[PDB]
Write a protein that binds this DNA or RNA. Sequence first.
DNA 1: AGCAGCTGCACCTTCACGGCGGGCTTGAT
Lengths: 333, 333, 263, 77, 77, 305
Amino acid sequence: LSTASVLAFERKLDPSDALMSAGAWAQRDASQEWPAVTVREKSVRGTISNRLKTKDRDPAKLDASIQSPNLQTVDVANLPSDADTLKVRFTLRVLGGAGTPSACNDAAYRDKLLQTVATYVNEQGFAELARRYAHNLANARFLWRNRVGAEAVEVRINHIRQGEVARTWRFDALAIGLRDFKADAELDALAELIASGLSGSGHVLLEVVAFARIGDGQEVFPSQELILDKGDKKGQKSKTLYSVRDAAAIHSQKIGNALRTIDTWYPDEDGLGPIAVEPYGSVTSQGKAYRQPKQKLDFYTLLDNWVLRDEAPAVEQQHYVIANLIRGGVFGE
Amino acid sequence: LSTASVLAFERKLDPSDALMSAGAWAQRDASQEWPAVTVREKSVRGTISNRLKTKDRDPAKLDASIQSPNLQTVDVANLPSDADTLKVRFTLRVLGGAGTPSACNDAAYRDKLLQTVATYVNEQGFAELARRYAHNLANARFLWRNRVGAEAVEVRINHIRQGEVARTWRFDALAIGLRDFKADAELDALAELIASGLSGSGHVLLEVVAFARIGDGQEVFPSQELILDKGDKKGQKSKTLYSVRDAAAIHSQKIGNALRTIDTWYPDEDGLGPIAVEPYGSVTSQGKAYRQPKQKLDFYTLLDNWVLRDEAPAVEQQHYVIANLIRGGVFGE
Amino acid sequence: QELRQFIESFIQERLQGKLDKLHPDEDDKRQTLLATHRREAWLADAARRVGQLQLVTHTLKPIHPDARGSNLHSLPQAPGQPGLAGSHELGDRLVSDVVGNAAALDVFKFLSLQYQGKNLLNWLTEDSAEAVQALSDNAEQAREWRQAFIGITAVKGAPASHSLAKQLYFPLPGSGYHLLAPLFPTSLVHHVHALLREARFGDAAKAAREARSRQESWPHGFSEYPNLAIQKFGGTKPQNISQLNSERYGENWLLPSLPPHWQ
Amino acid sequence: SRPTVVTVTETPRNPGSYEVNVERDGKMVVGRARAGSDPGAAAAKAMQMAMEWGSPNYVILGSNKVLAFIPEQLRVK
Amino acid sequence: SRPTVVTVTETPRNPGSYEVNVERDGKMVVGRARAGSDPGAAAAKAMQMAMEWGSPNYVILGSNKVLAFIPEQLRVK
Amino acid sequence: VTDPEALLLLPRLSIQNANAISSPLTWGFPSPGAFTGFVHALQRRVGISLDIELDGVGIVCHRFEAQISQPAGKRTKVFNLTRNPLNRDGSTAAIVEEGRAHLEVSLLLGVHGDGLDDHPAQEIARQVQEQAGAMRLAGGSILPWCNERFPAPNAELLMLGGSDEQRRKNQRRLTRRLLPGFALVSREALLQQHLETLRTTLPEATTLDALLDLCRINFEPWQVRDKPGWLVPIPAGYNALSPLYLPGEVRNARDRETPLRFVENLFGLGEWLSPHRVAALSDLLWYHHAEPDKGLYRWSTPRFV
DNA sequence: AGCAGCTGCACCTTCACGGCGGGCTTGAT
């Protein structure tokens, strides 16, 4: 009847921080003694290229301020002058036990949710969601700005069972698109492994390595940190990059957002591409929230109409509901 | 409609650090085993030659005028005593996809902006902008002080297709000038490829070499650092030069500014020469900012008249606005 | 009667501050402000505005800025075990907070006027001359407005929590568990840190600066406190959290407790 | 206060190269002299500046890659 | 400082040429002597200045091109 | 109450985004309450089927890194945040600050149950390690040790089994496995003795704890009075505020079959030791102490000194 | 025509608030 007041779901598909190293192409097989890329700090001189605030001031100050230079000091990460290949490496743990919540108040809602997830996994198992996750692992979507000028990307995936590699996949990330999910032979085996891990049987451990071919001495883009308080003028930095163990890296939540853009079922203009699975599915780069609560297609009204009133939606929205359960989150009323 | 609160743009025309080597002329075909130009440090014994203050009229300060050498410490770079060629090498990467902003906050302003850049590309291509970019690559404008007394300059351009050369351009950088854009048969074949990469239908990664004949053992001028600290005396150097792993170099923003001098239209006398592409058209070393906000000939007013009110400016101002979009930056409310 | 003129000047300073802040001279907006402020309709509005709670030991809004729950004003008992101790229960008597709607926060500024006791004016239950000295027209409005004033300080409410709060488990020695909902203690060691960093650092600091070789040394000192960390709760409007969070803007000023590096 | 202070930092504008600062009598006697492109050359330049500008006594500070080439006995005097 | 310290530095006013300093019980016995114009002669001069003046023990410092001519068991004693 | 019959040694674990802010007055290393909750979760998942009771954890912390930055011209530090998704209608969300950290830590844990027999000697520790890999320690996931140079196995070291010379050999062979680290212990008697010392005709309780952490570079000649080792304040449990409510009365509880009670933080003192200057490895274990009728839910290292 | 539900708007507090440094922990094969 009435829903719960505490309802939390833990996160499956847990990645690590993707670390960067530099090397040469055609030595991509012995790619373990490669040195890492390091962040440097350069001080630059430029102009005043921002809009003026012409209120409550004098114009002569602005005319002085535009005819004067502007000194800053930012961070930058490059490749060395004799290495054209960027290697991005991380791991992945698929846990399994998807529909079981980590917190639930009402026992009746818990039993009805368990029966709904059991009916879903009996009728339609994790065959579409794991296929889309394997597609997003296949094309190197986890290299965000390291993929716009890349000449060729190559993704190598290793399944680890006890202490050694049990199965090896290799994909060309440029032939596999970013906006259509086709069918293949090895991708279906990887999807079946991810599905067998998501169904509580195993906790699959994968190792993902990506090789991107940029060019000698060009720029690589690590993650940037959100710093709200840069102290005072004449000494501030205004750009800081992320690195672990003195090696430039990418945040784990960025990789997690990268392998999560599977939702193509949002109502208006679904041909623009997949977006990430979010309640009231929103993009920060767009400033727009698709799946508004006005048209009944968000997560909460769909879950309440599926569980409480048994008004089951279309299968393309049941996939979105179960993907939101796989992602995790905190909901309560 | 109104302007977005956050609005950012990417960077096309990405250069790298320009490295210096030193060797002989007429060995320009085997110029890959040349030793670098190592930055050197020395001490001088000058005289006091700054203008004296109003407090400086006393006897204890005209004694500084009479007998006081300065004893300063400075960096200096030099060719060897049997070498007359400075070779400067870097790599360029032209990406394309200019109009699409990297981040925004409006759905309506993004649609109007993309419609405006789209109808600009429908009316005319990037032929003027790619023409002036390849022209500024043709004469070796990235050699700033290394070009005012040189005997000959020669620029070689290689299109790296798949780790290897696919096309070669050879120029004469002193025949083509700095005050006029012309036409030829090789510059047009380069500008076609640059516009093809700039539109998005290709993959343009170039390798640029330039030879400058100075003289045996004379002074070359690498980039000077910007130490953003507090001033002091007798314990500072006040001249530090740039070097990449014991090899003299020039910063990437210097090489980027050099091949971005395409702006020959402004409200002042356009017969002087081209200035850089910046909002409010500023050249800070001269101490004058053209395209002032007193007149309606800057980037922001022309942009907000083109986008919101659909008041289009002249075609030259449209070329300037699209060059400002190709450069990048932060243009928002 | 006695202190009526003080609160009259208080409402007049509020009115003149509002007139200098808005400065609208169209359609008699200043007359529409003087219609409310110069009469005692402001006192009726200050009696109307309910939502303050006077809670110090429990403030839920640091855990999440929109977390509606129960807030408490109750100090624990002293523990029995030696060593550890918290919540400053020995001495240096405490200052209380105010949690509620920000739009009525100025009402607390009406109750904290330092004329014959600011905290005494905030809870004027003991006094009897001020209770009839507040108004001049009747007696029913006096008792009603006094009951509204002493009511919005201490109210109980209902025991509740939130899904965005914290709720843990604790193993018992026999079997079973407890649910252990923690809260945020509004303690002011911020003032101790400000005193030890900026009040008397100067004189003893210059005494240690320019009198090392000399025997002239003051009977005082200082403290450096390395590796502090600032934490902010309200983003740019800290008054939505509480009132003591407005006194100090963010600046939780967390103390370092980090493990040594081997080499 | 009493000894000279020799500091060996790594220049962050290019990783792998080092600089040395010598401070005597509370003022900077030598600033930003370059000290090679490996930690061994930085240790050699640090010990040279300690010998020459050392006077009675000195202390050597700096990076941990640099001080791995100097024994712990030879870092103070 | 008890043992002898031999430091080989490179002259930044003329790159490629080296110089050697010897410490020898807290007062320098060799100051900025001319070592070779290449890492091999600098290594030979450093080992000569360690053979003399290093009677109980010594420590040799220098660059990685210089110390690549001496085995790792002969630099410290 | 309990003394472990055997120790289990998990090798060097890695945690990527733990919790930095541990208490309303401290930041840095996480609270030991997280480790005690972790070993109780391991007990609830594995210890029922194998007839073993897992209790007590020694914390090592081989290395620790925090994601902080220092603003320009200030000696204070700030935290690096994340970017949460938008609320709705394109509006950015209000920031709630939280700190993160990277840990490399191994922990030894004492098992005392009679469910260890002659045939299960090494598969018990392997079955514990295979389950402690798909879990988290302080809100940060445990890094899984993919294809690398050489792995690291567990150990099941029996305490009473063996001669006394062999007992010291087993203690040395266990101490050699975790020597480049440290160990966190609780020093409450030292804090009480410093309270008795500092109280000289003036009343104070908690500025005692502030005194043992700052740098007293002030003295009449200047002099710096030192302290024994790394002394750090830690959150050592909670203290009750409200009476205990019955399991179905608190609105919006976590579960409706547990009594609920409003608590607040307590603060104690601790020290970071080296694991070779203790000579006792049945020590350094952390336990809970509840006293369920008066609050004061505490955890400590008993039998230490 | 009369309650439930959603969206827009007014209300409110407070000046950054110092730098010549400052500590205590590190094994044995």
